[PDB]
């Protein structure tokens, strides 16, 4: 630990050098480190890259990288420095240039990901105790605004930073009979889905479904729409790939439905 606070005041000391390599990277924060801190731990404690193994000192807190040249980064409460020492780490000419700008940009992605994760993970979080969908995790179509401290996340990013790709697909042929529900040119699989599962539909966000996962503990979004012969075409947006638990009962109970 001293050896490694004396590395990171020397490498601070010195900006600009040709064998030092030193960025910060902000996180997305929307609660502030109340209940980002553990949060922060965990992912210094976890978050890696191949090749190498992360050691957490627990006398300072910092992190070193391992193999399995320095590479160290800083967990405060509200900001991330990352020390990089080289003999020399502009020489791409077979020496380790070449792999530290690699290794910088491995991590500048890594803590992008991982800000989005976080995003992500606190918006299913506030979805599946509140009931309520954030302008973050899904962008605000025309019907959805149509129907209609934590901030400083919103007013520095821009809606759909948290937002998640479709974690699976489904398309279903719908029969001859659900051409059209009740509403004129509208399927009644819309109708059927909404008194299936009332229990899980979210207010704020038309046709979608949130429910968190027994085991994976996995609260991911449902996005149906009438795609043509108004047949099913469902998209699935979760964190992951989500196990049985959506993979096949919904499904099945669309199919029974």
């Given at each position: 630990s001293p050896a490694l606070h004396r590395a990171a005041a020397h490498i601070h000391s010195s900006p600009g050098r040709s064998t030092c390599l030193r960025q910060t990277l902000p996180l997305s924060f929307?609660?502030?480190?109340?209940?980002?801190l553990t949060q922060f731990k965990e992912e210094f404690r976890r978050l890696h890259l191949p090749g190498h193994v992360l050691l957490e000192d627990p006398d300072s807190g910092f992190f070193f990288v391992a193999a399995g040249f320095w590479l160290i980064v800083r967990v405060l409460q509200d900001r991330v420095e990352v020390y990089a020492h080289a003999?020399?780490?502009?020489?791409?000419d077979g020496g380790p240039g070449t792999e530290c700008r690699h290794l910088q940009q491995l991590l500048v992605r890594r803590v992008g990901e991982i800000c989005r994760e976080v995003n992500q993970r606190l918006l299913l979080q506030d979805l599946h105790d509140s009931h309520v969908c954030n302008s973050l995790l899904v962008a605000e179509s025309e019907e959805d605004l149509w129907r209609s401290g934590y901030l400083a996340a919103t007013m520095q990013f821009v809606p759909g930073h948290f937002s998640c790709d479709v974690v699976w697909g489904t398309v279903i042929r719908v029969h001859?009979?659900?051409?059209?529900?009740?509403?004129?040119?509208?399927?009644r699989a819309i109708q059927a889905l909404r008194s299936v599962l009332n229990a899980f539909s979210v207010v704020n966000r038309k046709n979608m479904f949130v429910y968190q996962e027994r085991a994976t503990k996995a609260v991911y979004y449902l996005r149906l729409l009438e795609t043509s012969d108004r047949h099913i075409q469902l998209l699935v947006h979760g964190v992951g790939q989500a196990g049985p638990e959506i993979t096949d009962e919904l499904v099945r109970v669309l199919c029974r439905r």
């Open positions: 929307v609660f502030g480190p109340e209940r980002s003999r020399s780490l502009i020489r791409e001859s009979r659900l051409k059209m529900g009740p509403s004129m040119g509208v399927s």
